[PDB]
């Protein structure tokens, strides 16, 4: 095989991370666990994580844009109505 | 000529060996590490070492005696070795240590010095003995929160918290006549021992029965002790096996003999009639491996341990091995079963017909404590020869096929895949 360029990820046995020592991990077989008999109720208080903690970062920008849209839309509707005829001619031409 | 077993209050068991030039007399208790708790874990190991303490050994040596003690999971032993003539001197020492003495061996200076000794001992084992440390962790995760999960040497945490009182509590609760068997092996007659025992009197806690608890349970799981600074990857993997006195005790031992043991550096080892060897030698997947069928009172472990410097191909090592195990359920051949029979017989013969009285003492005491007697090779060999291909397939379909596994590993185990990838290999796709 031809010489290949170094990257930041290797493969199993030489992944390229730092030497690991002192960490011990434990796991239990999925077969020995409760058959997912606790989806709702037990995961409702944890839910809304992407909500309570993230909603403002989404909501504020969304609110800003929605109101900006509604404002401009109401104005356009006014301009093209009978009552808006004078202002239309003013801002259009 | 058939191993005698007599009881007068104290159960005495002997195995006379005319070719033996020495004799071993001792006491085996039906309590081991499996009878301790996470907090007094190591108490038995501490007892073993105070019994082997210099003061106690010097006394024995003056009499021309040698002391031996073994801490196991289900049992515990204390043996004295001597010439066939000095057999009565052994009993006196044994009697002295477990009836007369108490505050002598449990003195402040002896206990502390012994405690410090086992502490450095256990620390070295956990720090350097990788293959055995891994096997101990296999038991720990496989039987977690159950008696069988406790290491026989104890843990550093519980060891450093142990006081003389803890030793006494254990002794009063387990070193009982109802939980013991006095053994006699090597060159000694049963009558010579029984009369020498029946010579003395007393009882020392009579009728007192040992403490009871909850049974061992196997749990599909794993414990990973990754250490990238170590030169190899050491792994132990197993399924729930057979307890002692299980109807499949020998079928399981034979199954393990099929895949056997291997040492890549030994020329003859590479030539064994093991199909797995054809798969693992091409890219040299490991330095060694050994299959086992560990049996205890409440449960057992069937699987293997392996060590390897081929850290990028661990997935192939595990895969090929488990694919071979799959074969026990669907395609194991008659010659594989016949080869296993012959080698199992040799293994048992080497284990039971060893030229060592202390070994015989441990085996004899342990068995008589569990089933009241000791099975002979003659009967064992007969059972082994009766095993068929259908028996192996029936056992494998029950214990191996699509069954949960316990895994333990240390060293460069980055290449050991996730639990589910390993667990999926316990079976094959079928139409
Ligand atoms: C591109 C769209 C086409 C989609 C077609 C869908 C494909 C469905 C394949 C369904 C079943 O394929 C089937 O899978 C099960 C596992 O789930 C296999 O089972 C195998 O593993 C399971 C689980 O460890 C063992 O219990 C079983 O004894 C073993 O044979 C079975 O041998 C195989 O035959």
Swiss-Prot record, chain A:
Topological domain spans for side Mitochondrial matrix: 1-48
Protein name: Cytochrome b-c1 complex subunit 8, mitochondrial
Subunit: Component of the ubiquinol-cytochrome c oxidoreductase (cytochrome b-c1 complex, complex III, CIII), a multisubunit enzyme composed of 10 subunits. The complex is composed of 3 respiratory subunits cytochrome b (COB), cytochrome c1 (CYT1) and Rieske protein (RIP1), 2 core protein subunits COR1 and QCR2, and 5 low-molecular weight protein subunits QCR6, QCR7, QCR8, QCR9 and QCR10.
Annotated gene: QCR8
Organism in which the protein naturally occurs: Saccharomyces cerevisiae (strain ATCC 204508 / S288c)
Note: Present with 6140 molecules/cell in log phase SD medium.
The keyword Transmembrane belongs to this UniProt entry's keyword annotation: yes
A Pfam family the protein falls into: UcrQ
InterPro entries the record matches: Cyt_bc1_su8 (IPR004205), Cyt_bc1_su8_sf (IPR036642)
GO molecular function: ubiquinol-cytochrome-c reductase activity
Gene3D superfamilies linked to this entry: Cytochrome b-c1 complex subunit 8 (1.20.5.210)
Alphabetically ordered keywords of this record: Electron transport, Membrane, Mitochondrion, Mitochondrion inner membrane, Respiratory chain, Transmembrane, Transmembrane helix, Transport
Similarity section: Belongs to the UQCRQ/QCR8 family.
Any GO BP: cellular respiration
Membrane-spanning intervals of the chain: 49-79
Role summary: Component of the ubiquinol-cytochrome c oxidoreductase, a multisubunit transmembrane complex that is part of the mitochondrial electron transport chain which drives oxidative phosphorylation.
Residues on Mitochondrial intermembrane side: 80-93
Location(s) in or outside the cell: Mitochondrion inner membrane
Any one Gene Ontology cellular component term annotated for this protein: respiratory chain complex III
Swiss-Prot record, chain B:
InterPro entries: Metalloenz_LuxS/M16 (IPR011249), MPP/UQCRC_Complex (IPR050361), Pept_M16_N (IPR011765), Peptidase_M16_C (IPR007863)
Record's bilayer topology term: Peripheral membrane protein
Gene Ontology molecular-function annotations: metal ion binding; metalloendopeptidase activity
Cell location: Mitochondrion inner membrane
Signal peptide: none
Keywords associated with the record: Electron transport, Membrane, Mitochondrion, Mitochondrion inner membrane, Respiratory chain, Transit peptide, Transport
Any GO CC annotation of this UniProt entry: respiratory chain complex III
Coarse class of the protein's main subcellular location: mitochondrion
Pfam families, A to Z: Peptidase_M16 (PF00675), Peptidase_M16_C (PF05193)
Biological process according to GO: aerobic respiration; cellular respiration; mitochondrial electron transport, ubiquinol to cytochrome c; protein processing involved in protein targeting to mitochondrion; proton transmembrane transport
General remark: Present with 19300 molecules/cell in log phase SD medium.
Complex formation: Component of the ubiquinol-cytochrome c oxidoreductase (cytochrome b-c1 complex, complex III, CIII), a multisubunit enzyme composed of 10 subunits. The complex is composed of 3 respiratory subunits cytochrome b (COB), cytochrome c1 (CYT1) and Rieske protein (RIP1), 2 core protein subunits COR1 and QCR2, and 5 low-molecular weight protein subunits QCR6, QCR7, QCR8, QCR9 and QCR10.
Function, in words: Component of the ubiquinol-cytochrome c oxidoreductase, a multisubunit transmembrane complex that is part of the mitochondrial electron transport chain which drives oxidative phosphorylation.
Family to which this protein belongs: Belongs to the peptidase M16 family. UQCRC1/QCR1 subfamily.
Descriptive protein name: Cytochrome b-c1 complex subunit 1, mitochondrial
Gene name per UniProt: COR1
